[PDB]
C-alpha cells in the first residue's frame with residue numbers, strides 16, 4: 001500500500017503479515033540495511049560499525065552454508081524438545097517477532113549443530129575428491 | 133604492450149579494444165579497485181567510502197545471482213524495444229563505453245526484472261526441496 | 265584441553281599438531297579474526313585496516329575459485345621442481361609453519377597459475393551456455 | 397600419480413607484526429571520579445580472560461632489545477601526560493621579583509624555608525596585593541645581577557612558561573592489560589633462564605598482556621613483579637661498558653618513606669579564575685625527608701646478586717661505588733610518593749664490596765637495624781626532561797608516608813686496566829624505556845597469516 | 859560581576875541564534891518507531907505504530 | 910508509509926536515553942561555536958559611575 005518499498009526499504013513492515021508472507025519478500029530488507037570537526041569521528045564510527053556488523057553476519061552465513069540463497073537447508077534434524085508446536089501454526093499464525101520470543105533459547109546450540117553438520121559434509125566431499 | 137597489468141592494474145585500457153576483448157580479461161580490473169592530524173579524517177573517509185561502494189555492489193550481485201562467475205545468465209528475455217542492433221555489432225564493433233551511452237536508459241527496469249526472475253527461481257527451488 | 269576455542273578463538277594452537285590435524289578444525293580460526301579524542305583515529309584506523317585485509321583476501325579467493333569451501337581443488341598440476349617431498353611427509357610430519365618456510369618461494373607463480381586455470385574454465389562454461 | 401594443487405584457507409601460521417596495542421584498562425579503576433584520574437579517563441575498560449595455549453610443540457625466537465612496542469608505550473606517556481594538563485594553571489603571572497629572608501638558618505635543609513613576599517594582581521586588574529608564601533628549594537634563584545640582596549627570581553624565567561597541575565587530577569599507576577587488534581596475536585615466554593633473547597620453548601598465547609602499572613623512577617625500580625625462581629641478570633651485551641644491566645630479584649624488600657612535618661596550605665587568587673597553591677606554614681618543628689630500609693635484607697641481596705653475577709665475571713671481587721655525579725635528577729633515586737617528588741641520595745647504600753666467596757652467612761636476632769637515606773623535595777621539575785613541559789607541584793597538607801614492595805635494579809659497570817681482579821658496579825638509569833622494557837619483554841606481537849597451499853593429488857570434476 | 863568567578867566572553871557578533879528543526883535520522887541498521895496514538899500516558903503498548 | 914499493521918509495541922518516555930544525546934550536544938555545540946572570539950578579560954577594571 002506501502003508495498004515492498006515501504007515494508008523493506010523502510011523496515012519491519014511485514015512483521016504483522018505472519019512469517020509465511022516472508023517467503024515472497026525477504027530481499028530488499030537486506031540491501032537497504034547496507035546503505036551509505038569532531039562529528040567526523042561520530043560519523044566514521046557509525047559507518048565502520050555498520051560495515052562490521054554486516055560482515056560478521058556474512059561470515060557466519062558462509063561457515064554454515066549454503067548460503068547465497070538466503071534460505072537454506074542444513075540437514076540437521078530438530079531436537080524433540082523444540083517441537084511443541086505444529087508446523088502450520090508456525091508458518092501461518094506466528095510472526096517472526098513472536099516466534100523469536102521463545103525460540104531465542106538455545107541459540108548457541110543451533111549454531112554448534114550447524115557448524116558441525118557442515119564440517120561433516122566437507123570431509124565427505126574431500127574424500128570424494130580424493131577417491132575420484 | 134601495456135598488457136593486462138597496465139590495462140587493468142591501471143584502468144580502462146581495454147575501453148579501446150571493443151567489448152568482445154573483455155571476455156579474456158575482466159579479472160584484474162576488480163582486484164585492483166579494492167586496494168589500500170586533520171588529514172586523518174580525510175583519509176579515513178576515503179577508505180571507508182571505497183569499502184562501502186565495493187560492498188554495495190556485491191550486495192546487488194548477490195541478489196540477482198549467479199554471481200561469483202562475473203558473467204552470468206539470468207534467464208530473463210530481452211524486451212524488443214532494446215533490440216535495435218545486431219548482436220555482432222554489439223560484440224565486435226561497439227565498446228562498453230559506447231554501448232553505455234544509450235543502454236543507460238531503463239536502468240531500474242533491468243534491475244527490477246533481474247530481481248524478480250531470481251525470486252521465482254528461488255520459490256521453485258524451495259518447492260523442490262519440500263517435494264523432495 | 266584448550267580445544268578448538270583456545271586453539272582457534274585464540275590463535276595458532278594447531279601449529280604444533282601437524283597439518284593433517286587442520287582438516288578437522290580450520291573454521292573458527294577465520295571467524296575470530298573478523299571481530300570488533302585523538303585515540304579515535306588510532307582506533308578507527310585499526311578497524312578499517314582489519315576490514316581491508318579481510319576483504320582483499322576474499323577477493324583473491326573469489327578470483328581463483330572455488331571458494332566457499334575453504335579447501336579447493338583448482339585443477340592445476342604441480343611443477344616437478346616443487347616435488348622434493350613425499351605427500352605423506354607433508355601431511356603427517358610437517359607443520360604449516362614449517363612447510364611455509366620453503367614453499368614461500370614462487371608465490372606469484374602459483375597465483376598466476378591459479379588465475380589462469382580459472383579463466384580457462386570460465387571460457388569453456390560460457391561456450392557451453394552459448395552452445396546450450 | 398600426477399599431483400594437483402589445493403588451497404587451504406585459514407592455516408595457523410604467523411609472521412612478525414609491526415602494529416599497535418591499546419587500552420584494555422582494568423575496569424576497576426572506573427568510578428565517577430575516573431574523569432579526574434590520569435591515564436584512566438582516556439581509556440576503555442575491558443575484562444578479558446587468560447589464554448589456555450600452550451602452543452604445544454611450537455618454539456619461537458624472542459628479543460627484548462628489539463621490541464619496538466616499548467616506543468609506543470613511551471611516546472603515549474609523554475603525550476598523555478601533556479594533554480591532561482592543558483586546560484589549567486598557567487603560571488606566567490608568578491614571574492615577578494620576589495623578596496625574601498632566611499628561615500632560622502641552622503640546618504641546611506631548614507634554612508631554605510624562605511619567607512617570600514610579592515605584589516600581585518587582584519580580582520580587579522587595576523590593583524595589586526602584597527602577599528606571601530613559603531618556598532625553599534632554589535627554584536627561587538638569586539636575581540641575576542644583584543648583590544646578595546633580598547631580590548630573587550623564579551628558576552624558569554630564563555627558560556619557558558610553566559604550569560602547576562589541574563588540582564583535581566589523581567596520579568596513580570593503573571595497570572593496562574594491552575590487547576591486540578583483530579588479525580594480531582601476542583605470544584609470551586613462560587621460560588626461566590631466558591637471557592632476554594633466544595628460542596623460548598615454553599610458549600603461550602596472549603589475548604591481552606598482563607597489565608603493567610607504569611612507574612616513573614630511576615635506579616631502584618618499585619611496584620614491579622618478582623622473579624619466580626631465581627635472580628635474573630640481564631644485559632644486551634655483558635662486555636659492553638655502555639650497556640645497563642637489568643636485575644630481577646627473587647624476593648621482595650620493603651621500603652618505608654616519610655615526610656614527618658605537620659604542613660599547612662594556602663592559596664592565592666591571581667587575577668580571574670585560577671588560583672595558585674603554595675605552602676602556608678610549617679607549625680614549629682623541623683623536617684628531614686627520609687627512607688629506612690632493612691640492612692639485613694639488603695646485604696643478603698647484594699651477595700646473592702654477586703653470586704649470580706660471578707658467572708659472567710668469574711674469579712673476581714665485586715665492588716660497589718657511587719654514581720658519576722651531577723644534578724640530583726641524574727644522581728639520586730626518584731620517587732613520586734604521595735604525588736610529591738623526592739630526590740634520595742644513594743649514599744651509602746652502595747658503600748661495600750664482597751670477597752668472591754659471597755658466603756651466605758647471617759643469623760637470627762632481635763635486631764631491626766636499617767640503613768637510612770636522606771632526601772630532598774623539589775617543587776618544580778622537568779618531567780621526563782620535558783623542560784618545555786615544566787611543572788610546579790601542588791602542595792599537600794600532611795604527615796606523608798610511603799610504602800612500596802621493592803625492587804628492580806638498574807646497574808652499570810666500571811673498572812680500568814689497573815684492576816681486572818675485581819669489577820665495580822655503580823647505580824644507573826634515566827631511560828624510561830628500560831623501566832618498562834623490564835617487564836614488557838615477556839611478549840611478542842605477531843600477525844596471523846591465513847591462506848596457504850599444499851599438494852594433495854585429488855582433483856575437481858568439472 | 860564575574861571578577862570573583864571566571865573570565866567571560868561576549869559573542870562572535872556575526873552569529874545568528876535561531877532554532878532550525880533537525881529531522882534526526884537513523885544510521886544504517888537502525889530504524890525509528892513512533893506512536894500515532896492519542897490518550898497515550900507517556901508509557902505503554904501503543905497500537906497505532908508507524909515507522 | 911508504514912503503518913506496521915498488526916504490530917504493537919511498548920514505549921516509555923522517561924527512559925528514552927536519546928534526550929541525553931540531544932542535551933549533551935547542545936551544550937558542546939554552543940560552547941564550540943564561541944571559542945574564536947571576544948575574550949573579555951581586559952574589561953575587569955575599576956568602574957566609575959553615577960545614577
Ligand SMILES: *[C@@H]1O[C@H](CO)[C@@H](O[C@@H]2O[C@H](CO)[C@@H](O[C@@H]3O[C@H](CO[C@H]4O[C@H](CO)[C@@H](O)[C@H](O)[C@@H]4O)[C@@H](O)[C@H](O)[C@@H]3O)[C@H](O)[C@H]2NC(C)=O)[C@H](O)[C@H]1NC(C)=O
Pocket residue numbers: 688766768
Ligand atoms: C627509620 O630509621 C630511623 C633511624 O634509626 C629510625 O629512628 C629510630 O626511631 C626510633 C623510634 O623513633 C627511635 O627510638 C627512640 O629510641 C630511643 C632509645 O635510644 C636511647 O636508649 C637506648 C637504649 O638502647 C640507647 O641505646 C640510645 O643511645 C638512646 O639512649 C628511645 O629513648 C626513644 O624514646 C625512642 O624509642 C630511635 O632513636 C630512632 N633513631 C633515630 C632517631 O635516628 C626510624 O624510626 C626508622 N623508621 C622511621 C619511622 O623512620
Ligand SMILES: *[C@@H]1O[C@H](CO)[C@@H](O)[C@H](O)[C@H]1NC(C)=O
Pocket residue numbers: 511512528
Ligand atoms: C612572613 O612575613 C609576614 C609579614 O606579615 C609575616 O606576617 C609572616 O609571619 C612571615 N611568615 C613567616 C613564616 O614568618
